[PDB]
Amino acid sequence: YRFRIFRAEKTYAVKAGRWYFEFEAVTAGDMRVGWSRPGCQPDLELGSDDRAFAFDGFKAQRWHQGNEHYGRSWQAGDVVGCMVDMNEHTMMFTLNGEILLDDSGSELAFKDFDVGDGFIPVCS
């Protein structure tokens, strides 16, 4: 029969040189990391405006006004080192020492952005 945004002091902004910092993540969930301007919104999506440049591994996408598939995703217990050079306006991301690749076969993530008033670290 409700994401949380974290950053540094706006006074720590940089206008020249090469700056590099590490971001460790013991999980592999929704996390964005990059550098924003001292006008970033603490409630809007990190990168969705002209005030931040981030990267999200949950979809392997660089974040700007729009999203473009960039780099590869991470796993639980990883680190990512972000480097940006102001002499050439070049943003770089390295997942566990492995430099990230875009779709066009270029290690560069972001290019040709105005220096503005500075870039402060930010995570989401």
Side-chain angles (χ1 to χ4, degrees), residues 1-97 99-124:
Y1 295 104
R2 313 188 67 185
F3 53 91
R4 285 280 300 280
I5 306 185
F6 300 79
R7 65 161 195 185
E9 280 264 17
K10 282 172 51 181
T11 74
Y12 281 111
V14 301
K15 291 287 276 183
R18 298 93 187 274
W19 303 105
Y20 151 75
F21 86 104
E22 286 189 0
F23 173 54
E24 194 274 339
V26 304
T27 61
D30 203 335
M31 294 191 164
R32 313 191 188 190
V33 55
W35 292 333
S36 46
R37 303 188 182 276
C40 202
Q41 298 280 350
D43 61 334
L44 299 187
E45 289 284 346
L46 179 55
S48 88
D49 212 326
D50 211 24
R51 49 192 69 206
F53 308 89
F55 155 75
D56 196 339
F58 184 75
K59 302 185 314 203
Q61 297 177 3
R62 63 181 191 181
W63 265 112
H64 199 190
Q65 313 102 353
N67 60 329
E68 275 67 37
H69 191 274
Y70 171 80
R72 69 176 185 269
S73 279
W74 59 84
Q75 68 267 348
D78 297 354
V79 310
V80 58
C82 297
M83 309 87 74
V84 189
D85 192 334
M86 298 300 103
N87 306 125
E88 297 85 10
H89 304 161
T90 61
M91 278 170 214
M92 294 306 103
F93 306 87
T94 77
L95 181 62
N96 295 87
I99 190 180
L100 266 56
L101 278 295
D102 71 333
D103 302 337
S104 174
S106 189
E107 314 287 341
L108 173 142
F110 299 89
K111 68 154 64 68
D112 206 359
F113 47 85
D114 302 334
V115 61
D117 291 320
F119 283 104
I120 50 177
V122 61
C123 82
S124 188

